[PDB]
């Protein structure tokens, strides 16, 4: 019975959003992840260890693909993850990591309870020219679209990672605006 989590990659940041009803956690300054949730502490700790070790020895961000390989390996030698990061190898990237330890790349992805629902809407709205703010709003929309109760800054939560500001979890303000702005913007007609 997994809970909703959504990611949308763009050319100016990846955006992770969840149904709050602590589900977005930082792995490194350039890599967050959102999850469907206490079986995780070990994967998270591991992830972080890998990230920090690499960074210390190389003095650079770890390759998000390598990082996702490292966490999937852990499961492979036997819980569900949306890992999102920026690196200088393949820029913005988004991955889905299954409890199985198989992972795949995506550009939009939804996991959890309304996730066949959302993935359709993702599919016919995603394109490679979307701005971060479009994506921000897009995630909010899908989240209202599927949520049990209404959408306020208290039961859904946003975050993003960008080349320049590293990872971020939006506080209730930034998000208070955006949910209000999705209200105004979807009242055009």
């Amino acid at each position: 019975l997994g809970s909703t989590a959504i990611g949308i990659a763009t050319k100016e940041g990846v955006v992770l959003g969840v149904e709050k009803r602590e589900k977005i956690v930082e792995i490194d300054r350039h890599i967050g992840c959102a999850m469907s949730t206490a079986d995780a502490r070990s994967m998270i700790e591991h992830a972080r260890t890998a990230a920090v070790t690499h960074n210390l020895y190389y003095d650079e961000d770890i390759n998000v693909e390598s990082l996702t390989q490292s966490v999937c390996d852990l499961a492979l030698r036997f819980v569900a993850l949306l890992i999102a990061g920026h690196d200088a190898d393949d820029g913005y990237q988004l991955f889905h990591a299954e409890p199985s330890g198989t992972f795949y790349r995506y550009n939009a992805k939804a996991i959890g309870s309304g996730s066949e629902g959302a993935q359709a809407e993702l599919l016919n709205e995603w394109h490679s020219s979307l701005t971060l703010k479009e994506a921000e709003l897009l995630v909010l929309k899908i989240l209202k679209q599927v949520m049990e109760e209404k959408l306020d800054e208290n039961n859904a939560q946003l975050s993003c990672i960008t080349k320049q500001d590293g990872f971020k979890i939006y506080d209730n303000e930034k998000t208070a605006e955006l949910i209000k702005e999705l209200k105004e913007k979807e009242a055009a007609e």
Binding site: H46, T49, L56, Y57
Partner: protein, 124 residues
Amino acid sequence: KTISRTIESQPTLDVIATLPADKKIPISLVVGFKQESSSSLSCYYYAIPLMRDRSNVVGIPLLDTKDDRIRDMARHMATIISERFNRPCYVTWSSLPSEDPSMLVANHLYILKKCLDLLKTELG
């Protein structure tokens, strides 16, 4: 950069420890009870501190074990070392042929202290 030692007194301990001459160089610590044949490796453990680009540390069982006491002892020991020496460290807890559990429960705190002390001497 490596030292064999037996730390005397509360039982006697064996300690193989690799460390720096002179910051990316990790402390390495193998440690069991000394004996009067010899030892097996029970848990290997790693830790590395977070930077102030963010007093936590982070770490993982390199070679895990079923036994909580050994895990916690090897974790706790690596956590504290890495934090206090601001270096990564690898710690092995070894185990003697028929080593009784109590010997650990009864010497957790003491082994930590005599290890902090040793490293503390051998660096500063």
